[PDB]
């Protein structure tokens, strides 16, 4: 990564083995779970493209997903090149070259080049551009690797509501829809797939009800 | 009836057979039901006393009611004569005679006389006086021919509230009491004769509640 030194300049320092291993261990343990994305984001703080390929290349397993991601990274990169055309005429001696999709992916650029772009004034955030592609591609994966739809979430005849509400906001946690739609899902689908005994109870709370009151309301059921 | 002609004068025209038959059919189908009174009122628009006896005399069936009405018409007529005494001295050559209860009932007056009174300036509304007697006598009938009291309206143990609320405002529809009393009946009797399961529900709505919220509140019950 590129970090600030004591002297007050930005210099490159290598990433740590127990950081590396922590990246490995996350993937081992939580596979495609959503917590992987904030986790990634923290461990990618101040990271280079080069370090990001290192992290992706050091994965073992889940090769269908790893290929889907690659192909997303190239699509997003192809899109970078499309949207940002190359600039007019020859490159100035006084200046350094604009990046392409493949420089952002780290492929066509060298480390010193990656440090030039980020440390220079204005700086260009080639990490953050790759980061969105990774996060976007992470959404693709998460959405695919979900095994059950939100409509299929229902309360058992003997299942406590509580255990059901947990299941609901876990699956709701894997839905990516607008907040307004997710509000609509909350007031609607939760009660609808609730069991008759609690359903009866919830109808008596009326509208305007909040989760602690619903959760304490269906406790004996 | 007495209708306005194209020329801009009020002239008599006969009532139509499918109007006559529509009067017959109403009575056949809805007997003593309250909808008969607005219905009557519309079909009696611009009608004479003579036409009103025609309509009453052309009834078949419900002869106990027809006699009760007759006797109400004569009572109301006796009352007209009481309240309005005959006037001082002989009738003027330049003027036409004041009506009695029996002229209003159409009995002692001729059609041309009924047209004189209504078309003349000021006009006298002998139709509307008979109309109130008919409507008053219609209330007498409706109230008698009701078969069940409002206190006897109660919700079954398996009966949806909805079906009960319909029964309530139908019976409330046959009560003729002041609005304030009928408001008192609404907030009071409805809940009181509601079943324990819904009754419980309605107690949780508190006061200030409106019918859509009560009706959606007791839906699962």
Which of A204, A206, A208, A209 best tests the B interface by mutation, with the highest count of B CBs <10 A? A204
Sign for the pseudo-dihedral over CA of A122, A127, A130, A136 = negative
Q: Say if CB A168 and CB A153 are below 8 A apart.
A: yes
B219 touches chain A (CB under 8 A): yes
B217 touches chain A (CB under 8 A): yes
Residue whose C-alpha is closest to residue A117's, from A4, A10, A7? A10
Residue whose C-alpha is closest to residue A198's, from A166, A171, A159, A169? A159
| Contact across the interface for B205 and A203, Cβ inside 8 Å | no
Q: Say if CB B172 and CB B150 are below 8 A apart.
A: yes
Q: How many CB pairs under 8 A join A and B?
A: 15
Cα–Cα distance between A74 and A11 in angstroms, integer?
29
Quick one: closest CA in B to A197, which residue? Answer: B220
Cα–Cα distance between B68 and B133 in angstroms, integer?
12
Q: Detail the residues of B annotated as belonging to a binding site for ATP.
A: 18
Resolution given for this structure, in angstroms: 8.8
Cα distances (Å, whole numbers) of residue A42 to A23, A133, A142: 11, 16, 19
Q: Which residues of A touch B204 (CB under 8 A)?
A: 204, 206
Q: Say if CB A81 and CB A129 are below 8 A apart.
A: no
**Mind giving me the DSSP string for chain B?**
-EEE-TTS-EEE-PPPHHHHHHHHHHHHHHTT-TTHHHHHHHHTTT--HHHHHHHHHT--S-HHHHHHHHHHHHHHHHHHHHHSPPPSSSPPTTS-PPP-HHHHTTSS--HHHHHHHHHSSS---HHHHHHHHHHHHHHHHHHHH--S-GGG----SSS-HHHHHHHHHHHHHT----HHHHHHHHHHHHHHTS-HHHHHHHHHH-SS--HHHHHHHTS--
The β-bridge partners of B3 are B11
At B212, list the tokens. Answer: 């859509």
Q: Which residues of B touch A201 (CB under 8 A)?
A: none
At B79, list the tokens. Answer: 């009352």
Q: Say if CB A80 and CB A103 are below 8 A apart.
A: no
Cα–Cα distance between B76 and B138 in angstroms, integer?
13
Residue whose C-alpha is closest to residue A189's, from A162, A144, A155, A147? A155
């Amino acid at each position: 990564p590129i970090v600030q030194n004591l002297q007050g300049q930005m210099v490159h320092q290598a990433i740590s083995p127990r950081t590396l291993n922590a990246w490995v261990k996350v993937v081992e343990e939580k596979a495609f779970s959503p917590e992987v994305i904030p986790m990634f984001s923290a461990l990618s703080e101040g990271a280079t493209p080069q370090d990001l390929n290192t992290m992706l290349n050091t994965v073992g397993g889940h090769q269908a997903a790893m290929q889907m991601l690659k192909e997303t990274i190239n699509e997003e990169a192809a899109e970078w090149d499309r949207l940002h055309p190359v600039h007019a005429g020859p490159i100035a001696p006084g200046q350094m070259r604009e990046p392409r999709g493949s420089d952002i992916a780290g492929t066509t650029s060298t480390l010193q080049e990656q440090i030039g772009w980020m440390t220079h004034n204005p700086p260009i955030p080639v990490g953050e551009i790759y980061k969105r592609w990774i996060i976007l591609g992470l959404n693709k994966i998460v959405r695919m690797y979900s095994p059950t739809s939100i409509l299929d979430i229902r309360q058992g005849p003997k299942e406590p509501f509580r255990d059901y509400v947990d299941r609901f906001y876990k699956t709701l946690r894997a839905e990516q829809a607008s907040q307004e739609v997710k509000n609509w899902m909350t007031e609607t689908l939760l009660v609808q797939n609730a069991n008759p005994d609690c359903k009866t109870i919830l109808k008596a709370l009326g509208p305007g009800a909040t989760l602690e009151e619903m959760m304490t309301a269906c406790q004996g059921v």
